[PDB]
């Protein structure tokens, strides 16, 4: 499934991401655009033996289990397959646990490089 930006911004608001841990809705919308390009089926394999799954590109070494990554920790307690769903619930719940770590939203490389310190409100404007 490929979301529209206003379509995703409304889905993220109904899942409780607006101001979650002091992070406004626009930050979450901007992150999904530069991580997956609004695609729920997005899966990026890395040279280190791990893979990033779904709309929020969740890593298989620290957060989800794919039974293919050596040294896996599964801190989100879920299979990586659940994060490839058209229902964003599983991806949102794992993202809530991730951002609660010391890295905050910087855990998302594309958010730090393209969203952090910009006018994130523009992503939820006109919806």
């Amino acid at each position, epitope marked *: 499934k490929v979301f529209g930006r206003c379509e995703l911004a409304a889905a993220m608001k109904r899942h409780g991401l607006d101001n979650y841990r002091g992070y*406004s809705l626009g930050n979450w919308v901007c992150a999904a655009k530069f991580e997956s390009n609004f695609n729920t089926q997005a899966t990026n394999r890395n040279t280190d033996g791990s893979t990033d799954y779904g709309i929020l590109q969740i890593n298989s070494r620290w957060w989800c289990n794919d039974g293919r990554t050596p040294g896996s920790r599964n801190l989100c307690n879920i299979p990586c397959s659940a994060l490839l769903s058209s229902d964003i619930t599983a991806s949102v719940n794992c993202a809530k646990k991730i951002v609660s770590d*010391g890295n905050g939203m910087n855990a998302w*490389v594309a958010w730090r*490089n393209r969203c*952090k*310190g*910009t006018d994130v409100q523009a992503w939820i404007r006109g919806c």
Partner: antibody
Amino acid sequence: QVQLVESGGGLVQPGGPLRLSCAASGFTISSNYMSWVRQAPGKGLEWVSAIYSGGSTYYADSVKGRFTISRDNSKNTLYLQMNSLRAEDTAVYYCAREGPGDSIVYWGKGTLVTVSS
Amino acid sequence: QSVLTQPPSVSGAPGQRVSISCTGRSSNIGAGYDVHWYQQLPGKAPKLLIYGNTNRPSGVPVRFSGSKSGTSASLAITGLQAEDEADYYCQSYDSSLRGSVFGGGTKLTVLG
């Protein structure tokens, strides 16, 4: 227009505290990503702490547990509380305004902190 | 040991092209985090020279350029001159240490 003036720097004994201030004018602290960066005499730059526009706070490992960053919207001022200071903490302390991707767009003049007996 | 590594010194003649390297780790540059560069004149606070990996802010001449691939980053200066003499620092973010990080710095001498 954009200004950052730091105060509270001076001499302190080892194991003692010190509180730094940073008064802003020409912009709003509550709407920006702010940080503290230090530089020891004749040494390199060291990142210390950061406060996000949403209210989130982050710290370097060398200062973790001892230091605390805060803000006051009524006075538009950034603070840095320093406890159990040692000789390695002697440095010029800079107040900084971040642009995109934690790049520093504007810097204060810096205040000197000397930890000696 | 060292989080971001730069050579302590570099030197070139006026008009010569020179480069300054910035070696990183799998937790910072190699993790996908962008590199920024700063120029520090003596008795002054640093000033942003390169943001992103290649972008120049207004006022920074075209003779200054940046490059970044894999675990390394580089700052190139073509047509070296007197005013280029300063300390240069690279900067990134480290996801293991959870924070922004600076290189040790490089002193650039213009000999001639």
